[PDB]
Amino acid sequence: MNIFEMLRIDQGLRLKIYKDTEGYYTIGIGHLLTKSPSLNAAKSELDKAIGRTNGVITKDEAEKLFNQDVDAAVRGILRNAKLKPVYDSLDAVRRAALINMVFQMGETGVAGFTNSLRMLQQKRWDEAAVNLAKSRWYNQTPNRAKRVITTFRTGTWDAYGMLDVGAASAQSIWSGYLEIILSNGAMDARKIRHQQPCDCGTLGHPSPEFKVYSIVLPVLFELAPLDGDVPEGVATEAELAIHFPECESLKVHPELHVEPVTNDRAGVKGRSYGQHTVYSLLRDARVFFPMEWATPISTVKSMNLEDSMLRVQLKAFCARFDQLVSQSQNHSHEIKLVKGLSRGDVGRAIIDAVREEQNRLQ
Amino acid sequence: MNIFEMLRIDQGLRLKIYKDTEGYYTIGIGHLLTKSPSLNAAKSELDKAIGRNTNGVITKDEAEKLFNQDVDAAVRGILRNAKLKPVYDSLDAVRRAALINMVFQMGETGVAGFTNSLRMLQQKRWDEAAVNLAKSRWYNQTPNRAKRVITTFRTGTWDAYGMLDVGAASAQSIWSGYLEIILSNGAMDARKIRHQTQPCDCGTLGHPSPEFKNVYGANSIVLPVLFELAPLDGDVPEGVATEAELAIHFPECESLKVHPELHVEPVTNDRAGVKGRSYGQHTVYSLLRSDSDDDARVFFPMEWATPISTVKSMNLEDSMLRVQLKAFCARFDQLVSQSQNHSHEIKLVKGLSRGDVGRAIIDAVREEQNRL
Ligand SMILES: Nc1nc(=O)c2ncn([C@@H]3O[C@@H]4COP(=O)(O)O[C@H]5[C@@H](O)[C@H](n6cnc7c(N)ncnc76)O[C@@H]5COP(=O)(O)O[C@@H]3[C@@H]4O)c2[nH]1
């Protein structure tokens, strides 16, 4: 990964205007806008900052805004006599770890770590990591401090997972659900149903009678917002924009669904698995596909984890989910995980995801 | 907890006679019966220990009676040992169990080898001793058990034997993702009983209709409680039990019967972009009603807690799975108990093994009859 992923995990990312801890309007990864109590005043600074917003900005814009902050923070480091020698000595990864401290505490704050910085400069990682864990910075935010400290000691991104909650949930959804339905048959073999009776065909080849409504995609889209912002329930067309931001032509078809897979498990006869609602996008001909949200994400959110820990586990969830997908045999391109930093980012990620699945078939 | 749960996690517990690493017949928590290769000799030796006709199958309270007999004998040998008596006497109750844990694993002569580590414990240098113990071969050979025993020495608490544990995530999984969803429709007693091939005015769990009592008995009673079975070793049966296979699924659950034709109505809900996902259609089980010694029965809905089966598929080390599943029951009971309107609608049946669950089910169902 990179320094951007590091701070999104440790600090978080917001693509809507929010009030920070002291109440001042901020965007992206902790980018201060104004000390004015006028929501419009901050928006005016935001509009000129990107040159476009209505208070909402995109992912690659927030990463463009982040790099502007990164260079300015590095600029101040070179202007600070206590932080210049250590930065010059550090390697690429450990430079990001020091930059994280400046983003959290300010250049004046990081300069206070006189003893800890000298141990880093003399490449005494174990010695420095023990001293950093004794500070007030560690006591205030130990989850973030542990990962930044672990980054200094080892120089790797390893802190950012066999017994992780996120990887266990990715293991939970694959073995306890997706593997069951995939064992039944192929995705193109899965029958399409109307809530009417229709011989509506299958996902791979929709029947000519179905073509009332065009192509249908035999791909299960599993949506994973990396901030855990999953909408509850299923959206009606009125609420569709609330559930799925920035999906231009998206529509929801409650009356159509993919047939569920019946299983016997844990003392339950005919447990229903993998019943999907069919959604469409503009291809006025449209593209129908079955998609659903990654349901462990909603449950892990209910555990009330610390915000950075929730982002850490969801990051492990997607990392292992893709790995299990890569090792999948005889089920090539049937499961696609749509990853987004926020719920809105998923909406834009859905559009390209469906386009790339069309191109492989067409 | 206590020393019994500590060793039950670290070593495991068996209620059937088994051969240990060296081939000797054993019961409970590493309790040697005989060095004879004759299974009958071991069964007779077990009978003399318990004062019963066991045939090799033992209960929890019997295995804990045998465990404390090993504990006292192990403490006695320690007090007879000049290298271990000063350190044992200085330690507190919890840290004493940790020292007893090492004796159970490697023997008094083995534990006596830790000359440097034991002296740090005697003069209360916890952090220093925990670092020195982690340098031994005992740590490299058995790292999961050594880590928990070392943490017990360092902190003097049972915290190592079960905040974001894998077991608690699965316990949150079943509560937030299933049980809470089903209960959001209404109370458990309001849930209707359904027949497979017919329409039956069968009533609800809280109020069984007169037609239901016509088919299954005029003294039949139905409990509006969902019994969630939790085997603490992860032994969950595959699939659903048939009438013939009932004994395999539920060992030593006396008079148990299964009614495939009866089921609790499923709850349809909207989740994760799914319209009307079907939830909680349960199989109805019955037991003979000890209330009135008759043929009248007690009907209840029962199923296994399937995250236990899911957690097993992650291929954890035996002791690590026991730690996580114990955390699962701790978080599952905590979530159920703290509910403000669903406290006695869900009852979690905990057992040390699958056989232990079979006897635990009866106690659970009898306990619900008296409450209602
Ligand atoms: N999109 C989707 N469609 C499904 O049909 C489905 N079924 C399961 N899952 C998810 O895969 C994983 C399988 O784990 P498990 O079954 O052990 O725990 C489940 C199980 O203990 C219980 N549960 C939920 N739904 C059912 C059900 N229909 N039958 C029996 N038990 C259920 O509650 C737990 C959490 O369910 P979800 O939190 O919604 O997510 C599960 C889970 O993350 C599904 N995901």
Residue numbers in the entry:
A (entry chain B): -16 to 35, 37 to 144, 149 to 183, 185 to 200, 202 to 203, 207 to 276, 282 to 360
B (entry chain A): -16 to 145, 150 to 359
Report text from the authors:
To gain insight into the evolution of choanoflagellate STING and define the molecular determinants of 2′3′-cGAMP selectivity, we purified SmSTING fused to a stabilizing T4 lysozyme domain and determined a 2.7 Å crystal structure of the protein in complex with 2′3′-cGAMP. The structure of choanoflagellate STING reveals a surprising combination of features previously thought to be unique to bacterial or metazoan STING proteins. The SmSTING cyclic dinucleotide-binding domain forms a canonical V-shaped, homodimeric architecture that is conserved in all STING proteins across the tree of life. At the base of the homodimeric interface, SmSTING helix α1 forms a hydrophobic stem known to be required for dimerization of human and metazoan STING proteins. However, the SmSTING stem sequence ASAQSIW is distinct from the canonical GLAWSYY motif in human and metazoan STING proteins and exhibits increased hydrophilic character more similar to bacterial STING stem helices. The SmSTING structure also reveals an additional beta strand turn β1–β2 previously observed in some bacterial STING proteins that extends the canonical β-strand lid region responsible for sealing the ligand-binding pocket. In both SmSTING and bacterial Larkinella arboricola STING (LrSTING), the additional β-strand turn extension forms two pairs of hydrogen bonds with residues on the underlying canonical lid. In the SmSTING ligand binding pocket, residues S160, T262, and T266 form a hydrogen-bonding network with 2′3′-cGAMP that is remarkably similar to interactions in the binding pocket of human STING. However, the conserved arginine residue R264 instead makes nucleobase-specific contacts to the guanosine base in 2′3′-cGAMP, mirroring the nucleobase-specific interactions observed in bacterial STING.
Here, we define a complete cGLR-STING signaling axis in choanoflagellates that reveals a remarkable blend of evolutionary features derived from both bacterial- and metazoan-like immune proteins. Biochemical analyses demonstrate that choanoflagellate cGLRs specifically synthesize the nucleotide immune signal 2′3′-cGAMP and that the associated choanoflagellate STING proteins exhibit correspondingly selective recognition of 2′3′-cGAMP as an activating signal. Choanoflagellate STING proteins have a predicted architecture similar to human STING with four N-terminal transmembrane helices fused to a C-terminal cyclic dinucleotide-binding domain. Mutagenesis analysis of the SmSTING cyclic dinucleotide-binding pocket confirmed the critical role of R264 and other conserved residues in controlling 2′3′-cGAMP recognition. Together, these structural and biochemical analyses demonstrate that choanoflagellate STING proteins share an overall architecture conserved with animal STING proteins and reveal how retention of bacterial STING-like features contributes to selective ligand recognition.
